[PDB]
Amino acid sequence: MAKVRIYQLAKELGMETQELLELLDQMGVAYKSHASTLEEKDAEAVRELVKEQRGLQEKLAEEERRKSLPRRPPVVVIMGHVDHGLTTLLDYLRKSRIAEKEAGGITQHVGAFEVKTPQGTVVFIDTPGAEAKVADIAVIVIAADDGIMPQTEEAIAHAKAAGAKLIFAINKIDLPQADPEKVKRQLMERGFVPEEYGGDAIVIPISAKTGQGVQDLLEMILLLAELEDYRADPNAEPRGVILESKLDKQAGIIANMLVQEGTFRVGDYVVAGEAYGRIRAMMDADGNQRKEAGPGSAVQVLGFQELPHAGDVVEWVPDLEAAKEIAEERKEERKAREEEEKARRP
């Protein structure tokens, strides 16, 4: 401190000579060389300025990082004619992760399940949809033998309405009457031109029965997820969607929720449409109790006081009172629109 030479102060602060000499020029402190002695008040000023500038750097670098949100996994729904092997595909995907279980032990149905690959994790909504936005991607399954049917065209229209990206999966490619070329013509008739022919429709041959092609579907999902670059903020206000709800004799009202933003925690108050409660417990697809559920997580939630509806947005609220006010304001507004039916003009 009193008195320090510039090369000594540099060592102490971990700076290179020329950096400290630059700083002193910025401060207007004259010196002959790095061997010169500094007045105590100059050295002190240097120490303060360097501390601050380093504070500031760090603040800045933190900000740059914090504003880059982590990846969230792609959410996928499987759709198409119920006879075209949807459940066989879902089942196949559910098994490629119980290889030869732990185990075990243990599994729960919580509305969605995860498929892990070296390239990343995919979230599949459980039970195909006939049927808020839930899925990023809809896989439209079409049997090679049967071709595009009315259920197929409804699945396509619902997926498009919901804003999902389509992947066409032509299944049963090993039946003797399998005709994928016919399916592709049917697709092109409908404005879906396969990439093969220079169009934008993604078309993938699979067999849900043997699993042939299934790894290519997963790779394609993950590639699209990399390009769309799906991300979410785990510290935003928690937001989810109800996938389904039911009564348990033993447990009471249960609901499956998929988390989209923020992180829900046990003890949080939530409102979903007109239903509300305090999260008493959350259980994931492995049957584990979780204290927290962040983006992409599907969990069974205990604590709702009435059955929430499928597709309703789950919102964090600060307290019980807020939860009751929000749910109630929605209830009396619904009655209002309904009362705009009983009166005039039925």
Which one, 244 or 315, has the nearer CB to Mg ion? Answer: 315
Residues numbered 196 to 225 that lie near Mg ion (CB under 5 A) are none
Which one, 126 or 315, has the nearer CB to Mg ion? Answer: 315
Nearest distance in Å: CB 181, Mg ion: 47
Rounded CA-CA distance 113/132 in Å is: 19
Structure tokens at 151: 């259920």
Nearest distance in Å: CB 14, Mg ion: 53
CA neighbor of 298 nearest in space, from 75, 136, 66: 75
Nearest distance in Å: CB 132, Mg ion: 9
Which one, 220 or 310, has the nearer CB to Mg ion? Answer: 310
Q: Which helix (H) or strand (E) holds 143?
A: strand 137-143
CA neighbor of 216 nearest in space, from 202, 226, 206: 206
Rounded CA-CA distance 303/269 in Å is: 9
50: contact with Mg ion by CB under 5 A:
no
Nearest distance in Å: CB 323, Mg ion: 10
The only residue of 21, 310, 313, 322 in contact with Mg ion, by rule CB under 5 A: 313
Rounded CA-CA distance 321/319 in Å is: 5
Structure tokens at 10: 């540099």
Which one, 194 or 308, has the nearer CB to Mg ion? Answer: 308
The count of chain residues that interact with Mg ion, using the rule CB under 5 A, is 2
**C-alpha dihedral over 320, 325, 327, 331, to 10 degrees?**
150
Which one, 124 or 316, has the nearer CB to Mg ion? Answer: 316
Nearest distance in Å: CB 330, Mg ion: 8
Binding site for Mg ion (CB under 5 A): 313, 315
